[PDB]
CSV table of C-alpha atoms in Angstrom, one decimal:
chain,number,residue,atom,x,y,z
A,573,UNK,CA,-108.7,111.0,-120.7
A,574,UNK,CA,-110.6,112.0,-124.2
A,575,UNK,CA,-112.2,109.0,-125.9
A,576,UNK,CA,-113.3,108.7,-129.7
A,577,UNK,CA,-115.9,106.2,-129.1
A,578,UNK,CA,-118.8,105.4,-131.9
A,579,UNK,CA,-119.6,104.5,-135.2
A,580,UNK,CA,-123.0,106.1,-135.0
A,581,UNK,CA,-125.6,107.2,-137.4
A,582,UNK,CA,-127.4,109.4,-134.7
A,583,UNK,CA,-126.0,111.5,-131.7
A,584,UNK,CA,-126.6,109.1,-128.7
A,585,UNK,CA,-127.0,109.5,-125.4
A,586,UNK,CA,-123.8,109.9,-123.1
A,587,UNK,CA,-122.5,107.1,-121.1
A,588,UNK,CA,-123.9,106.7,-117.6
A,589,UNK,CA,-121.6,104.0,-116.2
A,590,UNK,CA,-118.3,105.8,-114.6
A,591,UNK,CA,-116.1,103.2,-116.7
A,592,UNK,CA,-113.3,104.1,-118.8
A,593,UNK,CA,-114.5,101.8,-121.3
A,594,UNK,CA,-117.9,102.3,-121.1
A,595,UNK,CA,-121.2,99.9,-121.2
A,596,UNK,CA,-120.3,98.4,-124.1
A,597,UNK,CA,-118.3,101.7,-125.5
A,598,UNK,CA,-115.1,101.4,-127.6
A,599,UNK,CA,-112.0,103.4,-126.2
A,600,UNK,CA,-110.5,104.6,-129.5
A,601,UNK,CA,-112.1,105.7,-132.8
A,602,UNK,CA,-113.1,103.0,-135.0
A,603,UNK,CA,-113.9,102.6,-138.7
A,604,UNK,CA,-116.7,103.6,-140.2
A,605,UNK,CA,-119.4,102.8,-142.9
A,606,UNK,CA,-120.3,106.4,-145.1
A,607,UNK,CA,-123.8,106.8,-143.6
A,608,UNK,CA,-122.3,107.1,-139.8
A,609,UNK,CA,-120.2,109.7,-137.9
A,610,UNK,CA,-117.8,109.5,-135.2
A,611,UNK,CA,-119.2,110.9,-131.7
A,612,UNK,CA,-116.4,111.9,-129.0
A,613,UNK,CA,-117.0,112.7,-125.2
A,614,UNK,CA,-115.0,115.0,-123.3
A,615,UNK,CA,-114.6,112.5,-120.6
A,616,UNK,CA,-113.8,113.9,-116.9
A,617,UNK,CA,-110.8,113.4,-115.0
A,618,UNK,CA,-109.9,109.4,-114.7
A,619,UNK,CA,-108.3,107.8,-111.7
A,620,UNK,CA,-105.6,105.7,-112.6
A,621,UNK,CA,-105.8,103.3,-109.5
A,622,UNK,CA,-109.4,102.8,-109.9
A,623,UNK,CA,-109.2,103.1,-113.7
A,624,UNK,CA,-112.9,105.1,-113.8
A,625,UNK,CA,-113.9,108.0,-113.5
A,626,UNK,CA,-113.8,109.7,-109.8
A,627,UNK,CA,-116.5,110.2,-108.0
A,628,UNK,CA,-118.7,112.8,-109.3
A,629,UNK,CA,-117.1,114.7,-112.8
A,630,UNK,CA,-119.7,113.0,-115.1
A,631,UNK,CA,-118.8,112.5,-118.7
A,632,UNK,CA,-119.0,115.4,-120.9
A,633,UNK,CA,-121.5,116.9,-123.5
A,634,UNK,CA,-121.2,113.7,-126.6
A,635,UNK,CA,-120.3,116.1,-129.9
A,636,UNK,CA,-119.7,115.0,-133.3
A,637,UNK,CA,-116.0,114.5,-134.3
A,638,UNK,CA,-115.4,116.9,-137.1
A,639,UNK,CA,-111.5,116.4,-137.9
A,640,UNK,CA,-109.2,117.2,-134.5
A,641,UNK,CA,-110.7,118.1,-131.0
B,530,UNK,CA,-112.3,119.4,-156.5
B,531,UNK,CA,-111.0,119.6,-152.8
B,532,UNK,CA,-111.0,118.0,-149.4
B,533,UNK,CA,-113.9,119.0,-147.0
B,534,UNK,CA,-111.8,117.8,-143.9
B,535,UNK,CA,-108.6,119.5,-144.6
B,536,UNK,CA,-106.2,121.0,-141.7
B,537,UNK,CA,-106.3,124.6,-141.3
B,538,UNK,CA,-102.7,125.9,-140.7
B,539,UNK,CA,-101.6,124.6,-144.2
B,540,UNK,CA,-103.1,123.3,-147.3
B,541,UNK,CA,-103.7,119.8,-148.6
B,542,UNK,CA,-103.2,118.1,-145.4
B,543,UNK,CA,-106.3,115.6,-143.5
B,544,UNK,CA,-107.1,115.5,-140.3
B,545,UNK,CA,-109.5,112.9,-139.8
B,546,UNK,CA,-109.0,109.3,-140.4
B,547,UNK,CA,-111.5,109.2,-143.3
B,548,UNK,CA,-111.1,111.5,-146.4
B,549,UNK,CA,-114.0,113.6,-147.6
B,550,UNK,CA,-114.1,114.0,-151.2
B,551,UNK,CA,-116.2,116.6,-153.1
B,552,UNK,CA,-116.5,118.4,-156.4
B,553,UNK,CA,-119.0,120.8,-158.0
B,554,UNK,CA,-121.7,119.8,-159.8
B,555,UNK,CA,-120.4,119.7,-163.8
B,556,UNK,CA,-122.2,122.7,-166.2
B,557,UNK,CA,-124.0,121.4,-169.2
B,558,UNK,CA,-125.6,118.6,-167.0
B,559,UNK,CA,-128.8,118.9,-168.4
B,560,UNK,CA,-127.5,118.9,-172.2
B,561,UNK,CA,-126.9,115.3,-171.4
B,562,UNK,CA,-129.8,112.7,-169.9
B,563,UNK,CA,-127.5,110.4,-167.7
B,564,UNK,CA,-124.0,111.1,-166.3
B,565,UNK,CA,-121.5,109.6,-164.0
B,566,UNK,CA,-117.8,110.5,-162.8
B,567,UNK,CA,-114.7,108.0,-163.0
B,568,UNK,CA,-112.5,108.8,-159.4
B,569,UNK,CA,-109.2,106.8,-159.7
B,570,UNK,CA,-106.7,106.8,-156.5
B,571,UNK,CA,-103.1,106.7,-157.0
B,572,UNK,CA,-100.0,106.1,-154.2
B,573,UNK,CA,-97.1,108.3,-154.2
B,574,UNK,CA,-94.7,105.5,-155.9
B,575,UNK,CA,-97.7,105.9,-158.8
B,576,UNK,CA,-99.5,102.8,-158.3
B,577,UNK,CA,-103.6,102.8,-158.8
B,578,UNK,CA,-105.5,101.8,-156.3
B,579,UNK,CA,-109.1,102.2,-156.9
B,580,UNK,CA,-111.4,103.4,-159.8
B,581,UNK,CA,-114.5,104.1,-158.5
B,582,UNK,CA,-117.5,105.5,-160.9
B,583,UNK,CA,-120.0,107.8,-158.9
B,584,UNK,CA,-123.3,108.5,-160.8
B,585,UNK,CA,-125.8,111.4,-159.3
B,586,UNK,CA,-123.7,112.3,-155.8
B,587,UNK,CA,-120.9,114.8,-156.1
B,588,UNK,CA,-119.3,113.9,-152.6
B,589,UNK,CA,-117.6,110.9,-152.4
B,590,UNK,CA,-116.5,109.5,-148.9
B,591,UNK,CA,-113.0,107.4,-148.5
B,592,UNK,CA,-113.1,105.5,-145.8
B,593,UNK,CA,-109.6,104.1,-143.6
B,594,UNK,CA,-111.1,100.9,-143.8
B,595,UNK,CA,-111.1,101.0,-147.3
B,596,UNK,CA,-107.6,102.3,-147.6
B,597,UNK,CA,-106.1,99.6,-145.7
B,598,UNK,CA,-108.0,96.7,-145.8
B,599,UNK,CA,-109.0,97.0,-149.8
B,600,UNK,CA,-105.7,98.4,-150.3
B,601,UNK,CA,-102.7,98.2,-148.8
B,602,UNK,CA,-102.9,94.2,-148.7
B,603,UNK,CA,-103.7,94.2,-152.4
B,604,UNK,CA,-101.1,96.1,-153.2
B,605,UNK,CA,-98.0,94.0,-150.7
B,606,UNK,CA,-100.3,92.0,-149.0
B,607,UNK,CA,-99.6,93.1,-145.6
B,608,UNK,CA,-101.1,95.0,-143.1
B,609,UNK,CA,-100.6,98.8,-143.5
B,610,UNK,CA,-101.8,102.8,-144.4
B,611,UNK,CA,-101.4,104.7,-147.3
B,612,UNK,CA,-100.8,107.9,-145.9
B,613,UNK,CA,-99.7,109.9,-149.3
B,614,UNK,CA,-102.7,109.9,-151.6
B,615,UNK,CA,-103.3,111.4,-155.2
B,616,UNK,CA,-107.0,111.7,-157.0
B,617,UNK,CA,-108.1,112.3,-160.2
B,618,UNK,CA,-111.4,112.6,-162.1
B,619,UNK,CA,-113.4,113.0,-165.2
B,620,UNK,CA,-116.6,113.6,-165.9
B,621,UNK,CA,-118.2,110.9,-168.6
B,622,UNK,CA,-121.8,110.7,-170.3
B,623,UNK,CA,-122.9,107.7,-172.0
B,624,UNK,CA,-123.1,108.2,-175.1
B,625,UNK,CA,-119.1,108.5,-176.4
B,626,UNK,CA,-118.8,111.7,-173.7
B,627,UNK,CA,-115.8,112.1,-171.8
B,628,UNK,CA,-114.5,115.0,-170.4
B,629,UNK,CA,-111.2,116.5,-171.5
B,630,UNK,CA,-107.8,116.9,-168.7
B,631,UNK,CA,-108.8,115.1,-165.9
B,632,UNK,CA,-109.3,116.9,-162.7
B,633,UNK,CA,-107.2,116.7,-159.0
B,634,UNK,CA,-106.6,119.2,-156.3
C-alpha cells in the first residue's frame, strides 16, 4: 500500500503506529488550503488479514507530493 | 502563462489534484504605482466560473476544493469535477489601464 496522507504546512514526522490508517492519519489525499502541501509515505508491505503493517518493514521516508509518485 | 504541475510525456495535461498557476512578472511595472491581474476560469461548454483579481503575487494556486465545491454545484448544483479547464488573464492598473488580448496557455 502507498498512502497520500496530510494537509500539512511542515514535513512531519513519519507515523510510528503499524496501522494502515495511521494515529489519526487520513488514507487518501485530501484537500488543501494554498499555504499547505501534501506529504506521502512509501508505506511497507501491508497484511491483508491483519490489515497493518507486518512485523518489522517500518513506514518509509515522508516526502512531499510533487504531482505523481 | 503556464502550469507549474504539468505532466511530462505531453503538454497541457495536470497531474496533481490542485492546479498551479503562474505568469511572469508584467514589464513596465514600475511606470505604474499599483497593479493587479483579473484571472477568469472558463468550462469546456464556455461557461465562467470564477474571476479572481490577484494584486502583488504572480502565482496563483487552484485548489480541487475550490473547483468542486465553489463550482461545480453552482454551476448544476450537484456534486462533481471539472476536469477540462480554460484560463485567461489581463493585466489592469488603476487608473483607466488595461492590458490589450488577454493572455492563456
Amino acid at each position: 500500500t502507498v498512502f497520500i496522507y496530510i494537509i500539512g504546512t511542515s514535513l512531519p514526522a513519519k507515523p510510528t503506529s503499524p496501522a494502515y490508517p495511521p494515529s489519526g492519519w487520513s488514507k487518501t489525499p485530501p484537500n488543501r488550503t494554498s499555504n499547505t502541501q501534501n506529504i506521502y509515505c512509501s508505506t511497507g508491505t501491508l497484511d491483508p488479514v491483519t490489515n497493518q503493517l507486518v512485523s518489522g518493514t517500518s513506514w518509509s521516508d515522508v516526502v512531499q507530493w510533487s504531482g505523481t509518485e | 502563462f503556464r502550469v507549474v504541475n504539468t505532466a511530462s510525456g505531453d503538454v497541457t495535461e495536470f497531474v496533481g489534484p490542485d492546479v498551479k498557476l503562474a505568469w511572469d512578472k508584467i514589464p513596465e511595472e514600475e511606470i505604474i504605482p499599483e497593479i493587479y491581474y483579473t484571472l477568469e476560469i472558463y468550462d469546456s461548454q464556455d461557461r465562467m466560473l470564477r474571476s479572481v483579481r490577484i494584486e502583488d503575487v504572480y502565482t496563483y494556486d487552484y485548489l480541487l476544493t475550490y473547483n468542486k465545491a465553489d463550482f461545480a454545484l453552482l454551476n448544476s448544483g450537484a456534486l462533481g469535477i471539472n476536469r477540462k479547464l480554460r484560463f485567461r488573464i489581463r493585466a489592469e492598473g488603476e487608473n483607466g489601464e488595461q492590458s490589450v488580448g488577454w493572455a492563456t496557455i
